C-alpha cells in the first residue's frame, strides 16, 4: 500500500496530526497503514481508527441522504450523482470491513478490543444497509445483526453495564433495530434495559471514561423519548 514504507510509529503520529488538522481522509489512510503492520491496536489507536473512518463515512452518508431526498422528491443527473456517492460510500465500508476481517478481529485479545471491533463490523454493515436494495440487502442486514449480537454476548459477559463500548454498542444495536430492521419494540426494549441497567449499576463508572458513559446514557434516553 501507499503507507508500506513508513514506520508504524510515524503513521500513528501522522494520524494524530491529521486529526488536529481535520484531514480525516488522510487520518484514515494513516491508520489503515498502521493496522496493516499486523500488530494489535491500543485503546488510543482504536480511537484514532474509529474517529477517522466515521468522519469520512459520515460525510458520505450525509451527502447520500441529501441526494437521495432530492431524488425521491422528483433527467438522469440526480440518480447518476447519487449512485456515484453511494459507490464511494460502499468502497469505504468495504475497506473498513476488510481491515476488520483481515487484521483486527482475532480469537483472543482484550474482550474490550473484541467487542469494539465486532461493534464496528456491525456499524459498517449497517451503513451498507442504509443504501442497499436487492439480494445485497437482507444478506447485509444479517451480517450486521450477527456481528452486533456476538458483540452483545461478550459485552454482557465481560464488561460492566456502564462501560462505554458496551453502552455505545447497545445504543447502535438499538438504532439498527429501529432504523434498519424495522423492529421498534426491540429497539425500545434494548435501549430501556441498557439505560436502566447502567443506572442500577451506576457505581461501575470508570474514572477515565465516565463522561463517555453518561453521554451515551443520555442519548439512549433521547431515543426513548423520540420513540415514545
Amino acid at each position: 500500500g501507499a503507507m508500506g514504507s513508513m514506520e508504524r510509529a510515524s503513521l500513528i503520529q501522522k494520524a494524530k496530526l491529521a486529526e488536529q488538522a481535520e484531514r480525516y481522509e488522510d487520518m484514515a489512510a494513516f491508520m489503515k497503514g498502521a493496522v496493516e503492520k499486523g500488530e494489535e491496536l491500543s485503546c488510543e489507536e482504536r480511537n484514532l481508527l474509529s474517529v477517522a473512518y466515521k468522519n469520512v463515512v459520515g460525510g458520505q452518508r450525509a451527502a447520500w441522504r441529501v441526494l437521495s431526498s432530492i431524488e425521491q422528491k422528483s433527467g438522469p443527473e440526480v440518480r447518476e450523482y447519487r449512485e456515484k456517492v453511494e459507490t464511494e460510500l460502499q468502497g469505504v465500508c468495504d475497506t473498513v470491513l476488510g481491515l476488520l476481517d483481515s487484521h483486527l478481529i482475532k480469537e483472543a485479545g482484550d474482550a474490550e478490543s473484541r467487542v469494539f471491533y465486532l461493534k464496528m463490523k456491525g456499524d459498517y454493515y449497517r451503513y451498507l444497509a442504509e443504501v442497499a436494495t436487492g439480494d445485497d440487502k437482507k444478506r447485509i442486514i444479517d451480517s450486521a445483526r450477527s456481528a452486533y449480537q456476538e458483540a452483545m454476548d461478550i459485552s454482557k459477559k465481560e464488561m460492566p453495564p456502564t462501560n462505554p463500548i458496551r453502552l455505545g454498542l447497545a445504543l447502535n444495536f438499538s438504532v439498527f433495530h429501529y432504523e434498519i430492521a424495522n423492529s421498534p419494540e426491540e429497539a425500545i426494549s434494548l435501549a430501556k434495559t441498557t439505560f436502566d441497567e447502567a443506572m442500577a449499576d451506576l457505581h461501575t463508572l470508570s474514572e477515565d471514561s465516565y463522561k463517555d458513559s453518561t453521554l451515551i446514557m443520555q442519548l439512549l434516553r433521547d431515543n426513548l423519548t423520540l420513540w415514545t
Partner: peptide, 10 residues
Amino acid sequence: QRSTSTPNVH
C-alpha cells in the same frame, strides 16, 4: 428526526 447513534467524539 433520525435516531441518534454513538457520536464521533473522544
